[PDB]
Design a protein around this nucleic acid. Structure first.
Ligand SMILES: [Mg+2]
Ligand SMILES: [Zn+2]
Ligand SMILES: [Zn+2]
Ligand SMILES: [Zn+2]
Lengths: 44, 258, 384, 51, 346, 78, 48, 66, 29, 59, 115
RNA sequence: AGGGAACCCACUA
């Protein structure tokens, strides 16, 4: 799974049961990437 | 045979404006034409958006909403275009929709204005109106922000959504001197005269007409850009005639059914 | 402790026995609807698709209930449960086997709320017995409860954010007693003050005052448009009050068509002069301020809250006491529907120019205020 | 059911082009929770194609 | 300055000394419920309830204390074209008729953000809550929902569209062949929307802890509460399209129609003066000054300024019926008034 | 020798209509001829208008005694 | 003017002393409602 | 946050006029003269540019997560 | 010399501004 | 955030228009409402509500 | 949540009928035309064009509810003339008038463009 | 096909 770091904005690939921490800067607030599922809006 | 015999006088015709006068018709006919101007003239507007990437500060439904309100040049194409519901295609095709794409990434340190110029259509006829004045600003991008989306613009009219309304301002009026007393002014001297008033400056109202009826109607139809302002009126008359023709066909079927 | 469990307004007796949470109840924001009758409530489809009524299967209605069962819970005009004779339930939300969709006589089908269902409809605080009234359900496609504008006066409700509750009677006995005891037309007149609880209100009152003035004349198309909204119209256009030069009907003729039966009533307008009844023009009013309804026809007079409001002896009160609750409900609905559509022609506004007096009037106001301040100064000097 | 949880596109009728997710499906009709609106519509499966 | 006796929420009221005082109190109450942009960094914050208007506008008619409240930098409301008319009877008893075409064009449209927090706690050896995607035979108590929305970490991704029967966080606790039971969290019933952001971190105790923001677009409905800056609150009674609304001789239809009966008992004359001053400011290009105690601004000056722009000086216009095209007999008071969308949606 | 009112009260009308509607929904024989009616309440209403409801109202006096009034014996008012 | 007679109209606008005195007067109605609801409701409950 | 594409009341395009309005105001135009120079004649369109608060400039000060 | 009345209305809202440049609105906290 | 400019506040994803004046307790923003009270060290003379005391001082 | 779809104002669903004629028995030679998925745009012109007919004794239209999309046109004619014939003649005259208006609009537009 | 209680605060009519 790919988590974008909060402050350095670099993608981190971590597995399950691993602590949340950035590989580069050590910052531990990370966000999920946008989904690859097909998103569709009526332009309304 | 009680049909009216209405006459037309075009007083002004520019690329965004028709000022015309319809005489010798009814108020109901004039108002129905005015309502069809807003609600029943079909144009082409974006109604299907998928967003592959949106790193902007505006969310995805925000961008889709702003894309739907961008007018597209629907002249001579919306007539030969099918409705998506009435089309036999599975998802979309050139017979019922126009495909737009957008792929803008900001890689510079100044703000990138993603405008309607960045909307790229596969149909050379149906383009954003400002791409044919500045361009309609969709979003602003900071460095590292991206907007990548694919849209389909179908045909529809203003009765469904206001993005398919082809007009900006339908100015409509009749009896500019209040001869019919349809409105009653408490102080007639306090009221400004209209553009079409035929009164001298000392008068405030026309003398009351007891036998009069609304018989002359002044229009200023202003186009948002999708159609030429005369094309809006011609398509409105055609659409109202088509609605009455379909109603007469169903009425004939109902009469012969009984 | 146990005493704390029992005592208080949140205790067992008052919080769980004298009043308690109930099933089959909805609550949402109320919005106006002048196109309903007084005994109707507009109900959102999501509330109606969620709240159910158990209908006993009979050979009279087995086919309709079978169709409702076949539609299921997903599509709205359908059903949620099937209760057999022995009492076990078949849930139609889990798309069960078609052997479970079999309906016999004696079963119960918990169908969704439909048009015409009787409900008790309520606003807190429930101060008197017109605060919980029976309404007929009308399904309307948006997320609000909808009420006739006359019914807002017994409920003490407006539409600035009021939420109201809707309880669905679950049996035929309770539905029947709500229909025979607590319907809105049956609750028009209170026993508290022997006067109606609801009258014509707001826009309908202002435009019926503006409508029954003496100089209100309607042309042929306007009269036909107004007669389109008169549900008790017998279908014949009356002879106009003026035939030549132009055929013109007055608003009194149209309201005489609205007035039901042969109501006889005498009221006065709010601007009726005190000296007129002792003058020479008492039966021919110069200002059209004595309201005379005779043989169900508005002979003369401008209607207002003194005639169409909640006061005793009014037109709606006499209409109730002479014609009955059903005819009075039709009277309320017809007044609202005809008047609100004439108000599209006449219109009614308020502006900053209605808050401005004449310059001489402002001078008189200033002179009166200055004289009063001088008088207060003189009284102060006398007391000092 | 093999349609529940599958993303789907309405291909016929007045909802054509809308993308949704089938919350509940039967042999005749399916409840399609629409991505574009705040509602779950009920549409027959002959008007549906699987993305 | 004598207008400095007012607080934060009473300093946005235009002409508050032309209103009755309880209506100033009511607006001060309802200025806190008005939806705009509550703070600039709203995209980072996992507020449990957030409301952001799409197009908040600064008022055309402001007070001079609003410069220090930063109301023109974080505004809450839109300048509506309000006509005070009795149209079809759907605005009676504190009710509002909005324009459906305007609402389609983005009028008072907002987003509502929910945040859901969940901790991946470890309560001894036996109880161990774990963020994972539940499996139908491993987990007991799975709620017959679509668990395929989640990823392999048990957390949904941003962009996935969700409703009240959908899981957003998959959390399973070990049970002391059912080795664990599902203790996942779902959206609230009758809620919906699209997952906007998913944030994963460690809490103070060092366990995994996630916050999920889901946005739902709120289009103004029948029943949504709208208030002017004068204590004139009301729900949307009905929405008509642009061809159904009444219109001026130049084609201007009101965005909002309110009842004339909301004025006289309430005596909110500052509402009418705000409409007049907004008309003058829009036709002039200025921003109207509505500082409470100002002798340089009265009704007659605004009326003369309005009559200088080819309008009736008292703000009335001849509207035509949207349905039939006939002139409405009574001329209608129409002008720009600052309206606010309150959080009380239906 | 019956001292109670000869009119059916509104509560008696409501309960008789509800009980007869429940009986008709539970497939009781109908004492009146019906022309295309499905709702048991409308059938009970017509059966009350025809003085054909087979129900006896037992009215309790405060001393403990009662009077049995047939529905056909009482005057239907509203 | 000192003891709270507002000599202006709502159209003319209130002077600051008149504004504060009108606020003092209008606060009384809100207090009267908010403290009379409880006593009135208790009276109604005992009456019932 | 950003200038609306359409005027709410009538539907005139006002989304292509915000940067031109800012450039005209930078050219020492009065706001009424700037609105007159942009073709905004109805006061419903003039309030769209007059009352607009460009919050997207303040939103673009924060760094993107990507 | 002193502030004329015609110059007064723009003067007071200057000094009020100088207040809110200095104190702000949450200075008491 | 003391003395930081608007750019420095925006680098920290903090709003320059945020006035502060609150605490962050367990991630929740808590504001302290100013509680009013009688002033201390001052002599106040009241009339008690028909009690055994006609007048009472208080400090 | 309870938002009707935007196409429901003008699209007939399956099993819905465009126009239904019901002869009301209150007065002779009167009919009610219930037209689904229509609004004031057609009701007003049909009512006015029927009012232009001297053989029509009553012509009116109404929308029973603005939240529904249904037009009721009540037409009463003279006994030697049917309401269905009056409705057909009104629609025919409206179509002829609109075609004449469209052709004269094209002529006037060509005159304005050419000079 | 449904594992919380209590208290506090804010608010709606
Ligand atoms: Mg209320
Ligand atoms: Zn990092
Ligand atoms: Zn196609
Ligand atoms: Zn505009």
């Amino acid at each position: 799974m790919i988590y974008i770091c909060g402050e350095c904005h670099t993608e981190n690939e971590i597995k399950s049961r691993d602590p949340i921490r950035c590989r580069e800067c050590g910052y531990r607030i990370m966000y999920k990437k946008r989904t690859k599922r097909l998103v569709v809006f009526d332009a309304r | 045979p009680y049909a009216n015999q209405p006459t037309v006088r075009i007083t002004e015709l520019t690329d965004e404006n028709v000022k015309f006068i319809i005489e010798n018709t009814d108020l109901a006919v004039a108002n129905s034409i005015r309502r069809v101007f807003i609600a029943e003239v079909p144009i082409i507007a974006i109604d299907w958006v998928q967003i592959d990437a949106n790193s902007s500060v505006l969310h995805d439904e925000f961008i889709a909403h702003r894309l739907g309100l961008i007018p597209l040049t629907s002249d001579d194409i919306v007539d030969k275009l099918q409705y998506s519901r009435d089309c036999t295609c599975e998802e979309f095709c050139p017979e019922c929709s126009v495909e737009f794409t957008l792929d803008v990434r900001c890689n510079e340190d100044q703000t990138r204005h993603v405008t309607s110029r960045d909307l790229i259509s596969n149909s050379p006829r149906v383009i954003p109106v400002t791409s044919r004045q500045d361009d309609i600003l969709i979003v602003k991008l900071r460095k590292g922000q991206e907007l990548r989306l694919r849209a389909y613009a179908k045909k529809g009219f203003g009765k469904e959504h206001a993005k398919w309304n082809p007009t900006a301002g339908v100015a409509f009026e009749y009896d500019p001197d209040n001869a019919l007393r349809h409105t009653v002014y408490p102080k007639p001297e306090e009221w400004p005269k209209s553009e079409y008033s035929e009164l001298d400056e000392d008068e405030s109202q026309a003398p009351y007409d007891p036998n009069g009826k609304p018989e002359r109607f002044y229009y200023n139809v202003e186009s948002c850009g999708s159609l030429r302002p005369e094309t809006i009126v011609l398509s409105a008359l055609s659409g109202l005639k088509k609605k009455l023709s379909d109603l007469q066909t169903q009425l004939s079927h109902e009469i012969q059914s009984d | 402790s146990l005493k704390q469990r029992l005592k208080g307004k949140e205790g067992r007796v008052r919080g769980n026995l004298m009043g308690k949470r109930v099933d089959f109840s909805a609550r949402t924001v109320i919005t106006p609807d002048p196109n309903l009758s007084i005994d109707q409530v507009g109900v959102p489809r999501s509330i109606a698709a969620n709240m159910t009524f158990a209908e006993i299967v009979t050979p009279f209605n087995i086919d309709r209930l079978q169709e409702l069962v076949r539609r299921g819970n997903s599509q709205y005009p359908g059903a949620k449960y099937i209760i057999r004779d022995n009492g076990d339930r078949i849930d139609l939300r889990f798309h069960p086997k078609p052997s479970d969709l079999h309906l016999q006589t004696g079963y119960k089908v918990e169908r969704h709320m439909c048009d015409g269902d009787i409900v008790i409809f309520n606003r807190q605080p429930t101060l008197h017995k017109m605060s919980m009234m029976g309404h007929r359900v009308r399904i309307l496609p948006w997320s609000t409860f909808r009420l006739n504008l006359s019914v807002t006066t017994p409920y003490n409700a407006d539409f600035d954010g009021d939420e109201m509750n809707l309880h669905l009677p679950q049996s035929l006995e309770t539905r029947a007693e709500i229909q025979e005891l607590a319907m809105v037309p049956r609750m028009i007149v209170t026993p508290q003050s022997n006067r109606p609880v609801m009258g014509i209100v707001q826009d309908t009152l202002t435009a019926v005052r503006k409508f029954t003035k003496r100089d209100v004349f309607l042309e042929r198309g306007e009269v036909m448009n107004l007669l389109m909204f008169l549900s008790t119209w017998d279908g014949k256009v009356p002879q106009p009050a003026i035939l030549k030069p132009r055929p013109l009907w007055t608003g009194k003729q149209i309201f005489s068509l609205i007035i039901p039966g042969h109501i006889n009533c005498i009221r006065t307008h709010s601007t009726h002069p005190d000296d007129e009844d002792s003058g020479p023009y008492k039966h021919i009013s110069p200002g059209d301020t004595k309201v005379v309804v005779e043989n169900g026809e508005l002979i003369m007079g401008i209607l207002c809250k003194k005639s169409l409001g909640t006061s005793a002896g009014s037109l709606v009160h006499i209409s109730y006491l002479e014609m009955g609750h059903d005819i009075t409900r039709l009277f309320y609905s017809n007044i609202q529907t005809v008047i609100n559509n004439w108000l599209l022609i006449e219109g009614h506004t308020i502006g900053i120019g209605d808050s401005i007096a004449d310059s001489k009037t402002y001078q008189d106001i200033q002179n009166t205020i200055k004289k009063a301040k001088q008088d207060v100064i003189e009284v102060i000097e006398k007391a000092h | 059911n093999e349609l529940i949880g599958q993303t789907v596109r309405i291909s016929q009728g007045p909802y054509k082009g809308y993308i949704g997710v089938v919350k509940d499906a039967t042999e005749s009709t399916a409840r399609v929770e629409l991505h574009s609106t705040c509602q779950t519509i009920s549409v027959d499966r002959q008007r549906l194609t699987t993305v | 300055h004598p207008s400095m006796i007012l607080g934060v929420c009473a300093s946005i009221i235009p002409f508050p000394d032309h209103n009755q005082s309880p209506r100033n109190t009511y607006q001060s109450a309802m200025g806190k419920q008005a939806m705009g942009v509550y703070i600039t960094n709203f995209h980072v914050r996992m507020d449990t309830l957030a409301h952001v208007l799409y197009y908040p506008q600064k008022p055309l008619v402001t007070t001079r204390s609003m410069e220090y409240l930063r109301f023109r930098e974080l505004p809450a409301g839109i300048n509506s074209i309000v006509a005070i008319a009795s149209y079809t009877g759907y605005n009676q008893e504190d009710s509002v008729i909005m324009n459906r075409s305007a609402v389609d064009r983005g009028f008072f449209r907002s987003v509502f953000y929910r945040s859901y927090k969940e901790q991946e706690s470890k309560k001894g050896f036996d109880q161990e809550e774990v963020f994972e995607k539940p499996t139908r035979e491993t987990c007991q108590g799975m709620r017959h929902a679509i668990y395929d929305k989640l990823d392999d970490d048990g957390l949904i991704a941003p962009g996935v569209r969700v409703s009240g029967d959908d899981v957003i966080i998959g959390k399973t606790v070990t049970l002391p062949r059912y080795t664990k039971r599902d203790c996942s969290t779902f959206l609230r019933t009758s809620e919906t929307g699209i997952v906007d952001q998913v944030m994963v971190t460690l809490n103070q105790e060092g366990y995994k802890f996630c916050k999920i923001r889901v946005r739902s677009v709120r289009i103004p409905q029948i029943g949504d509460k709208f208030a002017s800056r004068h204590g004139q609150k009301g729900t949307c009674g009905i929405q008509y399209r642009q061809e159904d609304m009444p219109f001026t001789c130049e084609g201007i239809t009101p965005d909002i129609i309110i009842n004339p009966h909301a004025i006289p008992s309430r005596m909110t004359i500052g509402h009418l003066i705000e409409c007049l001053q907004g008309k003058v400011s829009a036709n002039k290009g200025e921003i109207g000054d509505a500082t409470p105690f100002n002798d340089a601004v009265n009704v007659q000056k605004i009326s003369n300024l309005l009559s200088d722009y080819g309008y009736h000086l008292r703000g009335n216009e001849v509207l035509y019926n949207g349905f039939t095209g006939r002139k409405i007999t009574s001329q209608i008071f129409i002008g720009p008034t600052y309206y606010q969308r309150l959080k009380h949606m239906v | 020798k019956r001292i109670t009112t000869p009119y059916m009260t509104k509560y008696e009308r409501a309960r008789v209509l509800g009980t007869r509607a429940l009986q008709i929904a539970m497939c009781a024989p109908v004492m009146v001829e019906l022309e295309g009616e499905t709702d048991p309440l409308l059938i009970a209403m017509k059966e009350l208008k025809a003085r054909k409801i087979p129900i006896i109202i037992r009215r309790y006096l405060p001393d403990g005694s009662y009077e049995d009034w047939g529905v056909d014996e009482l005057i239907i008012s509203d | 003017e000192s003891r709270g007679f507002v000599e202006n109209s709502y159209l003319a606008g209130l002077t600051p002393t008149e504004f504060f005195f009108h606020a003092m007067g209008g606060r009384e109605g809100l207090i009267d409602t908010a403290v009379k609801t409880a006593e009135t409701g208790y009276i109604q409950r005992r009456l019932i | 946050m950003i200038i609306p594409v359409r005027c709410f009341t009538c539907g005139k395009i006002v989304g292509n006029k915000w940067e031109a309005y800012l450039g005209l105001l930078q050219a020492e135009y009065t706001e009424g003269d700037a609105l007159d120079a942009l073709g905004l004649k109805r006061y419903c369109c003039r309030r769209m540019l007059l009352a607009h608060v460009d919050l997207i400039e303040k939103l673009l000060n924060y760094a993107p997560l990507e | 010399d002193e502030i004329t009345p015609d110059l007064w209305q723009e003067a007071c809202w200057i000094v009020i501004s100088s207040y809110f440049d200095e104190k702000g609105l949450v200075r008491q906290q | 955030l003391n003395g930081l400019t608007d750019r420095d506040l925006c680098e920290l994803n903090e709003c320059p228009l945020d006035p502060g004046g609150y605490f962050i307790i367990n991630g929740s923003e808590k504001v302290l409402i100013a509680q009013e009270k009688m002033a201390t060290n001052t002599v106040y003379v009241f009339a008690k509500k028909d009690s055994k005391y006609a007048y009472t001082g208080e400090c | 949540m309870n938002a009707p779809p935007a196409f429901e104002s003008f699209l007939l669903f399956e099993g819905e009928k465009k126009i239904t004629i019901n002869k009301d028995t209150k007065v002779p030679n009167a009919c009610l035309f219930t037209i689904n998925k229509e609004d004031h745009t057609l009701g007003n012109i049909i009512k006015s064009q029927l009012l232009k007919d001297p053989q029509v004794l009553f012509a009116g239209y109404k929308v029973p509810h603005p939240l529904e999309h249904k037009i009721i046109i009540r037409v009463q004619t003279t006994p030697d003339y049917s309401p269905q014939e009056a409705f057909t003649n009104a629609i025919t005259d409206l179509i002829s008038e609109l075609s004449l208006l469209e052709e004269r609009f094209r002529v006037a537009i060509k005159d304005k463009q050419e000079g």
